[PDB]
Amino acid sequence: GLFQEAYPITCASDPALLRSARDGEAHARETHFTQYLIYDASPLKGLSL
């Protein structure tokens, strides 16, 4: 409410391309032909869940 912001989380368009989330964003597949990923950017990044 104070910042008027909203954090994205670990999400993509394929369960195929969701596989490269369990290694961090080092080699996370951002983009195949249309299939797009957005890594987690949040206070909740890197945490237990």
Add this chain to the structure above:
Amino acid sequence: GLFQEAYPITCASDPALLRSARDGEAHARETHFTQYLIYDASPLKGLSL
């Protein structure tokens, strides 16, 4: 004012190429067919910001 110089920052032609510059210049893509990338050369390099 003394050196008459100008430091280049991390900049590239493709957001394809920019993603590879994030984790260090060891395996960063310098260039492509006609695309090109400039790694950071600056007093600011290595820093948090």
